[PDB]
Amino acid sequence: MKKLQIAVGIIRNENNEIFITRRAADAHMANKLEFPGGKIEMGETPEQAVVRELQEEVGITPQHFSLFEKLEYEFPDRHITLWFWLVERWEGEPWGKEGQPGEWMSLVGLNADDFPPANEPVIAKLKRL
Ligand SMILES: Nc1nc2c([nH]c(=O)n2[C@H]2C[C@H](O)[C@@H](COP(=O)(O)OP(=O)(O)OP(=O)(O)O)O2)c(=O)[nH]1
Ligand SMILES: OC[C@H]1O[C@@](CO)(O[C@H]2O[C@H](CO)[C@@H](O)[C@H](O)[C@H]2O)[C@@H](O)[C@@H]1O
Numbered sequence: 001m002k003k004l005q006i007a008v009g010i011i012r013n014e015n016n017e018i019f020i021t022r023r024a025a026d027a028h029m030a031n032k033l034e035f036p037g038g039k040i041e042m043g044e045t046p047e048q049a050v051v052r053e054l055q056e057e058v059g060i061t062p063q064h065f066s067l068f069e070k071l072e073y074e075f076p077d078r079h080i081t082l083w084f085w086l087v088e089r090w091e092g093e094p095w096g097k098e099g100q101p102g103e104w105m106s107l108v109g110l111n112a113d114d115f116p117p118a119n120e121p122v123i124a125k126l127k128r129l
């Protein structure tokens, strides 16, 4: 079974809203809401990966961020380790830089059912902030 390391960014503005994108219909976890992020490549660290992935996907450079949660999840056909970075400072304005839907969502209104099931404990912990 495939094993992947994934770094994602929880992008939180001053109004307690999170920048959330929606995954393509032909992707793994198709049509799900998601924190922007992606695969950690050989020769880069988890910290470097979340910077690169947010630059690619939404056009911001995260800075002074922290590891909010790290967890493992077994999907039906792949095992993934997810690094959830809390990003409260960044350069740029996030947008759908890869043509994907993206918008600001109130933290209190997030519904874990809309996200991959791996995100359930993270969404709960976020609402506890
Ligand atoms: N990006 C992201 N992926 C998540 C989340 N929760 C979750 O289980 N996943 C899973 C879905 C995928 O199996 C994997 C993310 O890989 P990805 O498809 O974003 O990887 P990528 O951006 O590097 O891929 P690509 O655009 O090059 O095709 O992790 C999340 O909140 N954000
Ligand atoms: O690992 C994140 C953790 O480390 C601290 C310093 O103790 O932040 C450092 O690492 C971040 C990720 O690379 C950087 O963004 C930050 O600038 C750097 O100081 C903590 O702030 C954070 O919890």
Ligand SMILES: [Mn+2]
Binding pocket: 037, 038, 039, 053, 056, 057
């Ligand atoms: Mn990507």
Ligand SMILES: [Mn+2]
Binding pocket: 036, 037, 038, 039, 057
């Ligand atoms: Mn991605």
Ligand SMILES: [Mn+2]
Binding pocket: 038, 039, 053
């Ligand atoms: Mn990638």
